[PDB]
Design a protein around this ligand. Sequence first.
Ligand SMILES: CC1=C(/C=C/C(C)=C/C=C/C(C)=C/C=C/C=C(C)/C=C/C=C(C)/C=C/C2=C(C)C(=O)CCC2(C)C)C(C)(C)CCC1=O
Ligand SMILES: [Cl-]
Length: 314
Amino acid sequence: PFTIDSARGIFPNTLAADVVPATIARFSQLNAEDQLALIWFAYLEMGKTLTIAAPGAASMQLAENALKEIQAMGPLQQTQAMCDLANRADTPLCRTYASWSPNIKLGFWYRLGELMEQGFVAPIPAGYQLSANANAVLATIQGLESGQQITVLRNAVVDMGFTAGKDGKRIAEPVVPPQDTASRTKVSIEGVTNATVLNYMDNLNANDFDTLIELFTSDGALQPPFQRPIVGKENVLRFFREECQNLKLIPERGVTEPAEDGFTQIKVTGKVQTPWFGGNVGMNIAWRFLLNPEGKIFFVAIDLLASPKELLNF
Ligand SMILES: CC1=C(/C=C/C(C)=C/C=C/C(C)=C/C=C/C=C(C)/C=C/C=C(C)/C=C/C2=C(C)C(=O)CCC2(C)C)C(C)(C)CCC1=O
Ligand SMILES: [Cl-]
């Protein structure tokens, strides 16, 4: 209850799926052309059983100029551009890409994937064989749960491009209006009646970010899977609006314990669906909340769990 960074240690029994950042770190080592081929291979294979939702209209408009620029290039330059992104080279295209929210980056690649499939953008060379390191990276990915697989792909997409500057322009999709109060569902969590936790889940499921942020302490933080804590209301609200639209949180069960100085720690496990996959992928998630004496959120971590055996009382 003293520092955000120390709160990261609550519920240390929770086995997170650290194969995901392990696998990203291996992937990130690879030659850029192998990075692109590996993801193309993983995307095609995944596409046999799992269809990516179409990118939204707003997102596509925001990426349109950059997409058109690539499509207008000669094939060799197309491949160079894609390699630039994967290598995190400093180019205008890479800087533009880095200004984008994850969803806009994902929609940019969705479009390129389609164009590569159709042959209008330079495809991976015919009969391309992955490097030794890359083949093993792909094998690891394909052995993971689908929730882990899609998190690897997202993290690979988000990592591309080049950031120059701390206060650079941030482009995101427009913010959706909150769900009308009448049509809102309420979660039920075995063992957990805590109104802060329940309001957290319900407000996020309604896209009600302005209500959600009011649950947090001024200095409070939210820690997304495999990322550092996002600290303070401005940054946490920004993150909700840019990256947390249209989720479906399906918490199942939890456990509630005292913490130092009148705090309460609560762990919840359940599933989450992203709008990119809907009900076809349920990620196994834990939430770990540290609530202050008045019930506001000082810290919440969201963990992708190593396996379903990590869900409480499987
Ligand atoms: C790149 C590339 C390609 C294309 C690749 C493509 C098109 C790839 C597309 C990949 C896609 C669309 C991946 C989407 C992943 C989304 C996830 C993991 C969302 C998780 C959300 C969670 C857990 C949120 C949970 C949360 C909860 C519960 C909270 O309580 C608080 C909020 C928080 C957010 C933390 C080609 C195929 C063209 C080949 C070349 C190439 O390189
Ligand atoms: Cl998402």
